[PDB]
Tab-separated table of N, CA, C and O in Angstrom:
chain	number	residue	atom	x	y	z
A	1	UNK	N	105.143	-1.230	67.124
A	1	UNK	CA	107.062	-2.008	67.394
A	1	UNK	C	106.843	-2.984	68.605
A	1	UNK	O	106.040	-2.917	69.326
A	2	UNK	N	108.316	-3.435	68.378
A	2	UNK	CA	108.784	-4.097	69.609
A	2	UNK	C	109.997	-3.412	69.956
A	2	UNK	O	111.155	-4.299	69.268
A	3	UNK	N	109.930	-2.516	70.514
A	3	UNK	CA	111.568	-2.637	71.793
A	3	UNK	C	112.393	-3.629	72.682
A	3	UNK	O	111.073	-3.736	72.825
A	4	UNK	N	113.290	-3.549	72.469
A	4	UNK	CA	113.947	-4.592	73.790
A	4	UNK	C	115.617	-3.911	74.099
A	4	UNK	O	116.077	-3.954	73.517
A	5	UNK	N	115.077	-3.764	75.504
A	5	UNK	CA	116.509	-3.416	75.947
A	5	UNK	C	117.747	-4.557	76.982
A	5	UNK	O	116.984	-5.114	77.654
A	6	UNK	N	118.598	-4.613	76.149
A	6	UNK	CA	119.032	-6.241	76.617
A	6	UNK	C	120.514	-5.327	77.808
A	6	UNK	O	121.536	-4.774	77.159
A	7	UNK	N	120.066	-5.255	78.951
A	7	UNK	CA	121.271	-4.915	79.852
A	7	UNK	C	122.388	-5.400	79.708
A	7	UNK	O	123.819	-5.592	80.174
A	8	UNK	N	122.231	-7.032	79.188
A	8	UNK	CA	123.069	-7.844	79.060
A	8	UNK	C	124.525	-7.360	77.904
A	8	UNK	O	125.897	-8.039	78.338
A	9	UNK	N	124.034	-6.519	77.405
A	9	UNK	CA	125.578	-6.021	76.303
A	9	UNK	C	125.142	-4.424	76.738
A	9	UNK	O	126.362	-4.027	75.827
A	10	UNK	N	124.608	-3.820	77.272
A	10	UNK	CA	124.605	-2.518	77.078
A	10	UNK	C	125.638	-2.211	78.003
A	10	UNK	O	125.714	-2.478	79.471
A	11	UNK	N	127.289	-1.678	77.506
A	11	UNK	CA	127.974	-1.274	78.518
A	11	UNK	C	127.623	-0.225	79.345
A	11	UNK	O	128.030	0.147	80.534
A	12	UNK	N	127.100	0.436	78.825
A	12	UNK	CA	126.566	2.020	79.539
A	12	UNK	C	125.887	2.408	78.875
A	12	UNK	O	124.790	2.023	77.734
A	13	UNK	N	124.735	3.760	79.582
A	13	UNK	CA	123.173	4.390	78.944
A	13	UNK	C	123.892	4.400	77.335
A	13	UNK	O	123.042	4.679	76.639
A	14	UNK	N	125.165	4.475	77.124
A	14	UNK	CA	125.542	4.938	75.582
A	14	UNK	C	124.936	4.237	74.652
A	14	UNK	O	124.214	4.619	73.737
A	15	UNK	N	124.804	2.936	75.074
A	15	UNK	CA	124.575	1.642	74.186
A	15	UNK	C	123.176	1.565	74.376
A	15	UNK	O	121.720	1.283	73.520
A	16	UNK	N	122.506	2.208	75.382
A	16	UNK	CA	120.734	1.927	75.650
A	16	UNK	C	120.434	3.183	74.436
A	16	UNK	O	119.281	2.926	73.668
A	17	UNK	N	120.795	4.096	74.464
A	17	UNK	CA	120.075	5.487	73.588
A	17	UNK	C	120.080	4.697	72.162
A	17	UNK	O	119.292	4.970	71.345
A	18	UNK	N	121.246	3.668	72.047
A	18	UNK	CA	121.140	3.223	70.781
A	18	UNK	C	120.059	2.103	70.761
A	18	UNK	O	119.865	1.585	69.411
A	19	UNK	N	120.053	1.238	71.549
A	19	UNK	CA	118.970	0.371	71.644
A	19	UNK	C	117.740	1.191	71.480
A	19	UNK	O	116.671	0.502	70.860
A	20	UNK	N	117.323	2.167	72.184
A	20	UNK	CA	115.928	2.464	71.811
A	20	UNK	C	116.035	3.485	70.744
A	20	UNK	O	114.939	3.317	69.650
A	21	UNK	N	117.266	3.937	70.203
A	21	UNK	CA	117.212	4.609	68.889
A	21	UNK	C	117.343	3.427	67.360
A	21	UNK	O	117.262	3.879	66.522
A	22	UNK	N	117.515	2.173	67.767
A	22	UNK	CA	117.665	1.367	66.913
A	22	UNK	C	116.217	0.634	66.790
A	22	UNK	O	115.993	0.268	65.705
A	23	UNK	N	115.701	0.156	68.219
A	23	UNK	CA	114.157	-0.616	68.072
A	23	UNK	C	113.124	0.788	67.454
A	23	UNK	O	112.473	1.007	66.764
A	24	UNK	N	113.018	1.731	68.478
A	24	UNK	CA	112.253	3.024	67.876
A	24	UNK	C	112.473	3.328	66.799
A	24	UNK	O	111.740	4.147	65.990
A	25	UNK	N	113.673	3.252	66.386
A	25	UNK	CA	113.959	4.197	64.805
A	25	UNK	C	114.356	5.582	65.056
A	25	UNK	O	113.867	6.264	63.981
A	26	UNK	N	115.111	6.185	65.739
A	26	UNK	CA	115.047	7.752	66.244
A	26	UNK	C	116.385	7.870	64.793
A	26	UNK	O	116.814	7.253	64.449
A	27	UNK	N	115.963	9.548	65.051
A	27	UNK	CA	116.890	10.038	63.684
A	27	UNK	C	118.399	10.068	64.544
A	27	UNK	O	118.913	9.517	64.815
A	28	UNK	N	119.349	11.070	63.755
A	28	UNK	CA	120.690	11.022	64.246
A	28	UNK	C	120.610	12.312	64.977
A	28	UNK	O	121.310	11.626	66.386
A	29	UNK	N	119.794	13.376	64.865
A	29	UNK	CA	119.852	14.606	66.354
A	29	UNK	C	119.145	13.888	67.162
A	29	UNK	O	119.015	14.344	68.650
A	30	UNK	N	118.952	12.397	67.453
A	30	UNK	CA	117.917	12.118	68.787
A	30	UNK	C	118.342	12.396	69.935
A	30	UNK	O	119.753	12.133	69.798
A	31	UNK	N	118.310	12.964	70.767
A	31	UNK	CA	118.516	14.003	71.759
A	31	UNK	C	119.130	12.303	72.736
A	31	UNK	O	119.990	12.570	73.227
A	32	UNK	N	118.374	11.667	72.534
A	32	UNK	CA	119.023	10.149	73.599
A	32	UNK	C	118.607	10.559	75.097
A	32	UNK	O	119.328	10.312	75.924
A	33	UNK	N	117.513	11.065	75.271
A	33	UNK	CA	117.141	11.531	76.650
A	33	UNK	C	115.708	11.198	77.048
A	33	UNK	O	115.336	10.574	75.908
A	34	UNK	N	115.311	11.642	77.857
A	34	UNK	CA	113.495	11.362	78.620
A	34	UNK	C	113.044	12.683	77.396
A	34	UNK	O	111.735	12.757	77.217
A	35	UNK	N	113.591	13.895	77.088
A	35	UNK	CA	113.048	14.816	76.278
A	35	UNK	C	112.797	14.456	74.865
A	35	UNK	O	111.958	14.441	74.325
A	36	UNK	N	113.998	13.914	74.164
A	36	UNK	CA	114.095	13.288	72.817
A	36	UNK	C	113.171	11.951	72.182
A	36	UNK	O	112.479	12.155	71.667
A	37	UNK	N	113.291	11.512	73.636
A	37	UNK	CA	112.821	10.283	73.679
A	37	UNK	C	111.168	10.303	73.788
A	37	UNK	O	110.083	10.029	73.196
A	38	UNK	N	110.827	11.286	75.118
A	38	UNK	CA	109.579	11.530	74.920
A	38	UNK	C	108.736	12.267	73.971
A	38	UNK	O	107.850	12.042	73.359
A	39	UNK	N	110.169	12.776	73.268
A	39	UNK	CA	108.988	13.609	72.181
A	39	UNK	C	109.128	12.593	70.997
A	39	UNK	O	108.586	12.646	69.992
A	40	UNK	N	109.804	11.610	70.739
A	40	UNK	CA	109.672	10.467	70.266
A	40	UNK	C	108.396	9.643	69.782
A	40	UNK	O	107.461	9.604	69.705
A	41	UNK	N	108.575	8.713	71.121
A	41	UNK	CA	107.405	7.753	71.519
A	41	UNK	C	106.295	8.922	71.549
A	41	UNK	O	105.137	8.267	70.748
A	42	UNK	N	105.911	9.662	71.966
A	42	UNK	CA	104.928	10.349	71.919
A	42	UNK	C	104.802	11.465	70.441
A	42	UNK	O	104.665	12.403	70.468
A	43	UNK	N	105.525	10.751	69.540
A	43	UNK	CA	104.996	11.414	68.324
A	43	UNK	C	106.214	11.344	67.776
A	43	UNK	O	106.720	11.844	66.585
A	44	UNK	N	106.613	9.956	67.025
A	44	UNK	CA	107.653	8.828	66.459
A	44	UNK	C	107.847	8.083	66.243
A	44	UNK	O	107.511	7.109	65.393
A	45	UNK	N	107.397	6.985	67.664
A	45	UNK	CA	107.647	5.628	67.902
A	45	UNK	C	106.074	5.127	67.276
A	45	UNK	O	105.214	6.309	66.943
A	46	UNK	N	105.854	3.719	66.701
A	46	UNK	CA	104.631	3.299	66.242
A	46	UNK	C	103.946	2.234	66.856
A	46	UNK	O	104.487	1.448	67.232
A	47	UNK	N	102.509	2.514	67.591
A	47	UNK	CA	102.129	1.444	68.754
A	47	UNK	C	101.480	0.912	67.770
A	47	UNK	O	100.639	1.125	66.961
A	48	UNK	N	100.804	-0.031	68.620
A	48	UNK	CA	101.292	-0.460	69.915
A	48	UNK	C	102.422	-1.126	69.848
A	48	UNK	O	103.287	-1.555	68.696
A	49	UNK	N	103.124	-0.371	71.147
A	49	UNK	CA	104.877	-0.688	71.116
A	49	UNK	C	104.876	-1.737	71.815
A	49	UNK	O	104.794	-1.669	73.049
A	50	UNK	N	106.175	-2.315	72.100
A	50	UNK	CA	106.627	-3.518	73.253
A	50	UNK	C	108.075	-3.348	73.775
A	50	UNK	O	109.039	-3.455	73.534
A	51	UNK	N	107.996	-2.733	74.841
A	51	UNK	CA	109.440	-1.824	75.642
A	51	UNK	C	109.721	-3.580	76.246
A	51	UNK	O	109.790	-3.206	77.770
A	52	UNK	N	109.751	-4.351	75.606
A	52	UNK	CA	110.538	-5.581	76.655
A	52	UNK	C	111.865	-4.738	77.283
A	52	UNK	O	113.018	-5.010	76.679
A	53	UNK	N	111.550	-4.292	78.096
A	53	UNK	CA	113.224	-4.382	78.879
A	53	UNK	C	113.510	-4.903	79.937
A	53	UNK	O	113.446	-5.427	80.930
A	54	UNK	N	114.738	-5.888	79.218
A	54	UNK	CA	115.278	-7.031	79.959
A	54	UNK	C	116.184	-6.925	80.836
A	54	UNK	O	115.700	-5.814	81.767
A	55	UNK	N	117.519	-7.225	81.185
A	55	UNK	CA	117.741	-6.484	82.542
A	55	UNK	C	118.060	-5.248	82.878
A	55	UNK	O	118.635	-4.386	82.288
A	56	UNK	N	116.946	-4.551	83.560
A	56	UNK	CA	116.576	-3.276	83.532
A	56	UNK	C	118.027	-3.349	84.816
A	56	UNK	O	118.111	-1.871	85.057
A	57	UNK	N	118.073	-3.637	85.571
A	57	UNK	CA	119.772	-3.245	86.534
A	57	UNK	C	120.932	-2.730	86.017
A	57	UNK	O	120.970	-1.916	85.914
A	58	UNK	N	121.384	-3.167	85.159
A	58	UNK	CA	122.706	-3.102	84.618
A	58	UNK	C	122.280	-1.778	83.385
A	58	UNK	O	121.508	-1.564	83.042
A	59	UNK	N	123.276	-1.054	83.412
A	59	UNK	CA	122.924	0.548	82.919
A	59	UNK	C	122.522	1.416	83.627
A	59	UNK	O	122.290	2.606	83.400
A	60	UNK	N	121.547	1.121	84.877
A	60	UNK	CA	120.548	1.921	85.103
A	60	UNK	C	121.643	2.250	86.538
A	60	UNK	O	121.596	3.676	86.663
A	61	UNK	N	121.875	1.467	87.012
A	61	UNK	CA	123.149	1.923	88.591
A	61	UNK	C	124.457	2.246	88.106
A	61	UNK	O	124.919	2.950	88.761
A	62	UNK	N	124.870	2.467	86.756
A	62	UNK	CA	125.826	2.856	85.793
A	62	UNK	C	126.219	3.918	85.484
A	62	UNK	O	126.317	4.843	85.320
A	63	UNK	N	124.762	4.543	85.587
A	63	UNK	CA	124.787	6.098	85.592
A	63	UNK	C	124.020	6.909	86.842
A	63	UNK	O	123.818	6.286	87.692
A	64	UNK	N	123.031	7.789	86.704
A	64	UNK	CA	122.313	8.557	87.553
A	64	UNK	C	120.453	8.368	86.951
A	64	UNK	O	119.608	8.206	87.911
A	65	UNK	N	120.193	7.978	85.760
A	65	UNK	CA	118.732	8.016	85.816
A	65	UNK	C	118.940	7.845	84.362
A	65	UNK	O	117.692	8.530	83.439
A	66	UNK	N	119.462	7.196	83.238
A	66	UNK	CA	119.606	7.133	81.765
A	66	UNK	C	118.541	6.285	81.706
A	66	UNK	O	117.635	6.170	80.882
A	67	UNK	N	118.435	4.837	82.052
A	67	UNK	CA	117.723	3.948	81.670
A	67	UNK	C	116.387	4.151	81.972
A	67	UNK	O	115.264	4.153	81.899
A	68	UNK	N	116.306	4.651	83.692
A	68	UNK	CA	115.015	5.069	84.282
A	68	UNK	C	113.978	6.013	83.902
A	68	UNK	O	113.132	6.273	84.149
A	69	UNK	N	114.863	7.161	83.070
A	69	UNK	CA	114.454	7.819	82.138
A	69	UNK	C	113.513	7.618	81.464
A	69	UNK	O	112.529	7.794	81.031
A	70	UNK	N	114.664	7.182	80.024
A	70	UNK	CA	114.053	6.684	79.371
A	70	UNK	C	112.857	5.623	79.393
A	70	UNK	O	111.802	5.391	78.834
A	71	UNK	N	112.876	5.023	80.599
A	71	UNK	CA	111.506	4.552	80.720
A	71	UNK	C	110.288	5.060	81.607
A	71	UNK	O	109.352	5.032	81.470
A	72	UNK	N	110.808	6.512	82.188
A	72	UNK	CA	109.605	7.157	83.120
A	72	UNK	C	108.838	7.507	81.786
A	72	UNK	O	107.671	7.694	82.054
A	73	UNK	N	109.727	7.615	80.709
A	73	UNK	CA	109.115	8.278	79.438
A	73	UNK	C	108.186	7.552	78.465
A	73	UNK	O	107.328	7.654	78.358
A	74	UNK	N	108.633	6.035	78.541
A	74	UNK	CA	108.149	4.837	77.951
A	74	UNK	C	106.763	4.489	78.739
A	74	UNK	O	105.800	4.824	78.153
A	75	UNK	N	106.824	4.573	79.933
A	75	UNK	CA	105.521	4.270	80.422
A	75	UNK	C	104.774	5.476	80.562
A	75	UNK	O	103.498	5.797	80.506
A	76	UNK	N	105.391	6.680	80.546
A	76	UNK	CA	104.621	7.949	80.273
A	76	UNK	C	103.651	7.778	79.569
A	76	UNK	O	102.696	8.522	79.156
A	77	UNK	N	104.478	7.249	78.467
A	77	UNK	CA	103.609	7.164	76.925
A	77	UNK	C	102.065	6.277	77.046
A	77	UNK	O	100.895	6.574	77.392
A	78	UNK	N	102.758	4.906	77.648
A	78	UNK	CA	101.539	4.015	77.602
A	78	UNK	C	100.530	4.140	79.041
A	78	UNK	O	99.523	3.747	78.882
A	79	UNK	N	101.220	5.150	79.875
A	79	UNK	CA	100.218	5.920	80.691
A	79	UNK	C	99.247	7.240	80.123
A	79	UNK	O	98.168	6.844	79.879
A	80	UNK	N	99.908	7.951	79.732
A	80	UNK	CA	98.852	9.162	78.929
A	80	UNK	C	98.163	8.863	78.119
A	80	UNK	O	96.821	8.963	78.504
A	81	UNK	N	98.665	8.522	77.241
A	81	UNK	CA	97.477	7.640	75.790
A	81	UNK	C	98.604	6.696	74.895
A	81	UNK	O	98.224	5.960	74.613
A	82	UNK	N	99.754	7.085	74.456
A	82	UNK	CA	100.714	6.291	73.968
A	82	UNK	C	99.987	4.092	74.294
A	82	UNK	O	99.723	4.109	75.230
A	83	UNK	N	99.996	3.502	73.399
A	83	UNK	CA	99.470	2.493	73.346
A	83	UNK	C	101.019	1.498	73.718
A	83	UNK	O	101.325	0.591	72.642
A	84	UNK	N	101.970	1.690	74.872
A	84	UNK	CA	103.033	0.744	74.695
A	84	UNK	C	102.863	0.018	75.883
A	84	UNK	O	102.522	0.231	76.836
A	85	UNK	N	104.020	-1.374	75.788
A	85	UNK	CA	103.789	-2.006	76.842
A	85	UNK	C	105.241	-2.154	77.642
A	85	UNK	O	106.020	-2.445	77.002
A	86	UNK	N	105.570	-1.462	78.740
A	86	UNK	CA	106.469	-1.340	79.353
A	86	UNK	C	106.709	-2.357	80.190
A	86	UNK	O	105.958	-3.079	81.024
A	87	UNK	N	107.955	-3.255	79.845
A	87	UNK	CA	108.144	-4.415	80.601
A	87	UNK	C	109.308	-4.600	81.427
A	87	UNK	O	110.218	-4.041	80.718
A	88	UNK	N	109.344	-5.308	82.617
A	88	UNK	CA	110.396	-5.175	83.134
A	88	UNK	C	110.867	-6.374	84.056
A	88	UNK	O	112.207	-6.891	83.951
A	89	UNK	N	109.888	-6.930	84.392
A	89	UNK	CA	109.964	-8.563	85.307
A	89	UNK	C	111.256	-8.060	86.160
A	89	UNK	O	111.366	-6.972	86.563
């Protein structure tokens, strides 16, 4: 699939969990964190996936580790075995 993080519209990590829940297509109980996300990517999302993380600054410093976490997982998937392309530029 092709996920895309738009920090230009992400008001807070709240919209982030929705952007991943929208691209990855997560369910309602979606933990919206590195646990449910990692649980998803590693058993929910469809690879090869494209995590085009646009503005990774906004939303990331606005919290403590929401964007940097969904990312530690996205990358953890393309690393361990997942076939995801984590982009940030």
